[PDB]
Amino acid sequence: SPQPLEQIKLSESQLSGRVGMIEMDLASGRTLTAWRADERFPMMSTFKVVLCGAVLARVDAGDEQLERKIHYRQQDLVDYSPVSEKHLADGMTVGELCAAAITMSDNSAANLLLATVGGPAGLTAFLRQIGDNVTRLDRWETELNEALPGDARDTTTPASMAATLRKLLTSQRLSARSQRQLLQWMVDDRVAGPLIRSVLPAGWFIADKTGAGERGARGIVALLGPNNKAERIVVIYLRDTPASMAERNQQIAGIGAALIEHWQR
Amino acid sequence: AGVMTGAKFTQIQFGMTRQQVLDIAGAENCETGGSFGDSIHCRGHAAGDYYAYATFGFTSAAADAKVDSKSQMKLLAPSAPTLTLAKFNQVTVGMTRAQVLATVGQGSCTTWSEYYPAYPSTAGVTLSLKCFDVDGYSSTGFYRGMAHLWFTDGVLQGKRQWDLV
């Protein structure tokens, strides 16, 4: 309702935090709105879309199968792992692990998947391979959410993340089937209610992935658009604020609401 | 009513039926199937990028099946957390549960998961504890000093820690 950049300045003032935002045309890749787009922000669980993109790339190459079962142990279990800890005795398929990582931010699921792509270094190598020279994963769950001020580890920039999402979902670097699967996992996101979904008008499409970290870190990456068709990529990150989760969610939602209100203005 | 809570988690007991669990937890907080197989997963308050929760496992898919597994995240706080990196280093694989608690502090821990694979026998019981330093526990965010200690048949099988001292 304020314009997007007006709302962002209001949010930074109210939060004493730093917001990073990109609004990007999905088809053309053109940047439509930008704010601190070249500053680094902790990815938190938003990295998991890139992770499963790398997994799908391996599936496309015949080096991986979504149906392949992975077995694991107590030593592999870390905080925030509601799904993976339940299947400890039985194991989980690669596809089930991606579903849990993306839709539920399951940490151990993400760690198991990370091992299949060569760990944080392997995932970073994948990013360089697809032309992202900025985004980096350095640590595993749960340390990657530490969000120490000025720490470059496990960060992206709004500009880089937006470009990389577009590459993964539309550039046909992934097979059509893989693009559909990655998008589907994001559509089925279960933990993003308080964010863009809370202000999304009836009849709109949304696919998203969220993140939460220490020191106020919070974020969302999303594809959305009217008439139940994805039209734009929206990336919103927050860092360096002591504000409550409620306040942080409300501000991110408000920035999303501003983008929606001024969609064609 | 309300969402899932530590109080409800404590009231729910091994040996209960699915309906008993749902009645205590509040069915609107709970789900089964899909990602959770034939277990029951009940949401509490929002925490981090998910929710505090409980998950209950059962002896089979049958209606008369009994709770043989209880797991929770951020429903319970340690009573008197005194864990330190020094104490953690004193903990050794092969220790009994009693020995471990004596090492990390008698009020430092909460039970993450407890499973009786041979219920009603205790044979093969697996137990995971989280133990916290003085300011390590958080019910809504991220731990700031926590150790994962896991046991089989009451004997420590492994240990891990984050942020201690």
Side-chain angles (χ1 to χ4, degrees):
Chain A
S1 185
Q3 300 167 346
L5 297 182
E6 291 178 328
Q7 181 55 245
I8 288 176
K9 294 177 191 180
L10 284 160
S11 298
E12 285 196 349
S13 183
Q14 293 159 27
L15 294 168
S16 297
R18 309 264 141 172
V19 172
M21 188 274 288
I22 280 286
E23 178 192 40
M24 172 182 284
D25 186 62
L26 185 56
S28 74
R30 287 183 184 180
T31 295
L32 306 174
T33 316
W35 176 266
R36 297 190 196 278
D38 288 336
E39 295 195 18
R40 289 184 176 275
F41 292 80
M43 285 183 284
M44 307 153 297
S45 286
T46 67
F47 92 90
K48 293 162 187 181
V49 169
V50 179
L51 173 61
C52 287
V55 171
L56 289 165
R58 286 166 34 85
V59 173
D60 289 346
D63 294 324
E64 183 59 278
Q65 309 78 42
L66 291 185
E67 302 81 9
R68 178 172 74 92
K69 177 155 282 198
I70 291 183
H71 299 271
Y72 47 99
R73 305 169 153 200
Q74 277 296 147
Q75 63 188 60
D76 296 297
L77 294 187
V78 306
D79 197 17
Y80 286 100
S81 300
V83 179
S84 52
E85 74 188 8
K86 181 267 168 287
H87 296 283
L88 177 68
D90 301 320
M92 295 181 62
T93 68
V94 169
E96 287 159 4
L97 288 163
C98 270
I102 290 172
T103 73
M104 313 269 280
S105 289
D106 190 296
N107 282 344
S108 292
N111 278 352
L112 294 168
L113 292 165
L114 264 171
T116 72
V117 298
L123 188 55
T124 300
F126 171 75
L127 282 156
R128 301 291 177 270
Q129 170 188 339
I130 66 174
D132 185 337
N133 292 308
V134 172
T135 307
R136 53 186 286 182
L137 196 71
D138 298 81
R139 296 172 292 183
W140 303 75
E141 297 286 4
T142 52
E143 289 92 351
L144 62 85
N145 307 287
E146 193 177 34
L148 294 178
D151 197 349
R153 288 179 294 178
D154 314 302
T155 57
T156 188
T157 67
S160 287
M161 181 55 70
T164 288
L165 288 168
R166 184 171 171 265
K167 291 174 179 176
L168 290 174
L169 291 157
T170 74
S171 83
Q172 307 197 329
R173 273 180 180 76
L174 290 184
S175 71
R177 188 174 166 202
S178 286
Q179 291 179 158
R180 290 196 300 272
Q181 178 65 81
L182 189 56
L183 188 67
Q184 186 63 52
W185 284 324
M186 295 178 66
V187 165
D188 290 336
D189 191 5
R190 300 187 62 189
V191 301
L195 300 183
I196 295 172
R197 289 168 188 256
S198 77
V199 294
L200 190 75
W204 286 48
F205 173 89
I206 189 148
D208 57 16
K209 178 78 199 79
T210 61
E214 306 176 45
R215 291 147 186 103
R218 191 72 165 119
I220 180 169
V221 300
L223 278 62
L224 78 170
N227 302 311
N228 200 25
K229 292 177 294 210
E231 179 186 345
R232 300 180 192 166
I233 291 166
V234 168
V235 172
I236 302 166
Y237 286 111
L238 296 189
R239 70 175 202 259
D240 193 44
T241 168
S244 69
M245 177 63 79
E247 300 175 79
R248 294 182 281 129
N249 286 342
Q250 289 171 355
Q251 299 286 3
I252 291 176
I255 294 165
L259 288 165
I260 289 162
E261 164 70 7
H262 296 263
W263 193 251
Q264 296 282 8
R265 307 149 72 178
Chain B
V3 300
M4 187 62 196
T5 62
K8 293 173 174 179
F9 180 81
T10 298
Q11 188 182 343
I12 291 162
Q13 298 153 238
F14 291 96
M16 278 184 173
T17 60
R18 284 179 168 89
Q19 194 59 55
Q20 279 180 289
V21 169
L22 294 167
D23 287 348
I24 294 168
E28 75 270 17
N29 302 306
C30 302
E31 73 183 276
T32 187
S35 307
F36 294 101
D38 54 29
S39 294
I40 295 179
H41 178 76
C42 301
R43 288 185 186 175
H45 55 281
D49 209 16
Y50 193 59
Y51 305 86
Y53 63 83
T55 305
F56 306 104
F58 297 84
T59 52
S60 75
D64 73 341
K66 303 307 197 273
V67 171
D68 63 3
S69 185
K70 297 181 75 188
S71 300
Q72 64 86 30
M73 181 194 70
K74 290 170 187 65
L75 295 184
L76 304 167
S79 62
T82 65
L83 180 59
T84 66
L85 181 52
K87 299 187 184 185
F88 174 88
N89 285 322
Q90 292 177 294
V91 177
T92 60
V93 171
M95 275 176 83
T96 65
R97 182 193 160 104
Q99 285 168 337
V100 169
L101 270 290
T103 302
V104 306
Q106 300 291 338
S108 295
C109 310
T110 58
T111 301
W112 185 4
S113 71
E114 181 174 7
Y115 173 42
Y116 295 92
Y119 183 95
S121 173
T122 63
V125 54
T126 62
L127 172 81
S128 278
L129 302 178
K130 286 179 185 154
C131 306
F132 303 93
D133 68 17
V134 49
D135 293 303
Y137 177 70
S138 172
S139 68
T140 53
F142 309 84
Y143 306 135
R144 303 170 295 263
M146 182 274 285
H148 174 206
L149 314 175
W150 62 96
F151 305 78
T152 300
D153 288 310
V155 176
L156 189 74
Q157 302 297 309
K159 62 173 187 171
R160 286 193 62 184
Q161 69 87 20
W162 296 264
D163 306 320
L164 283 185
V165 164

